C-alpha cells in the first residue's frame, strides 16, 4: 500500500492540509460545522498537516 494514491484536500484550514481518504475528508467538513464541537476540534482539524 501507498497513500499518495489516496490523497485528498482537507478543504478547511491554513497549511495546505491534505488528509487520508474520502471518508476521512467528509467527516471533517461535516463536524467542522456541528457548532457544538469543542473549539479544539476545528483547531486540530485545522493546523494538522500531512
Amino acid at each position: 500500500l501507498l497513500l499518495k494514491d489516496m490523497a485528498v484536500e482537507n478543504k478547511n484550514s491554513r497549511d495546505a492540509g491534505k488528509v487520508v481518504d474520502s471518508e476521512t475528508a467528509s467527516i471533517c467538513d461535516a463536524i467542522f460545522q456541528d457548532e457544538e464541537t469543542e473549539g479544539a476540534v476545528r483547531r486540530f482539524i485545522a493546523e494538522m498537516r500531512q
Binding site: A40, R43, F44, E47, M48, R49
Partner: protein, 133 residues
C-alpha cells in the same frame, strides 16, 4: 553569546512544556522555535575540550524535525523527542564548561572557545529568544 542563552530556555521550556497529555495549541508557538533550531544546526560540526583534564568531545548534527500533529500528545511523541533533547543537553553542558574556564586579558569579555566563537557567527543569530533570565 546571547545565542547560547536561547539554546537553553529552548530546552527548559521544552523538557517542561512538552509532556504526555497536554493539548495541542500550548506548544504551537514553541514547537516552531524549536525546529527552526535543528535546521540552522544540522551540518555544522563542533569541538569541546582540549584543556587540562577536559575530554575532547566531538559533536555532530543530523536530526529529523517533528511530527507537528497529534492532538493530545501521545506518549510515543515525547520519547522520540526526549531522545533528541538529551543529546543537546549533554552538549550544552560540554559547551558551557569549555568556555567557563578560558581567560583573556586584552579582551576578556569576548568569547574564547572554538565552540562558542563559532556561535557568535551571524548564520546562528536566527535563534535568540525570551531573554527574561
Amino acid at each position: 553569546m546571547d545565542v547560547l542563552y536561547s539554546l537553553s530556555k529552548t530546552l527548559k521550556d521544552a523538557r517542561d512544556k512538552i509532556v504526555e497529555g497536554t493539548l495541542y495549541s500550548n506548544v504551537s508557538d514553541l514547537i516552531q522555535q524549536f525546529n527552526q533550531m535543528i535546521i540552522t544546526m544540522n551540518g555544522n560540526e563542533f569541538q569541546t575540550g582540549g584543556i587540562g583534564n577536559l575530554p575532547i568531545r566531538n559533536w555532530n548534527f543530523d536530526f529529523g524535525l517533528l511530527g507537528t500533529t497529534l492532538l493530545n500528545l501521545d506518549a510515543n511523541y515525547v520519547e522520540t523527542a526526549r531522545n533528541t533533547i538529551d543529546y543537546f543537553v549533554d552538549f550544552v553542558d560540554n559547551v558551557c564548561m569549555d568556555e567557563m574556564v578560558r581567560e583573556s586579558q586584552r579582551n576578556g569579555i569576548a568569547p574564547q572557545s572554538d565552540s562558542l566563537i563559532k556561535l557568535s557567527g551571524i548564520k546562528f543569530k536566527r535563534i535568540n529568544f525570551d531573554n527574561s533570565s
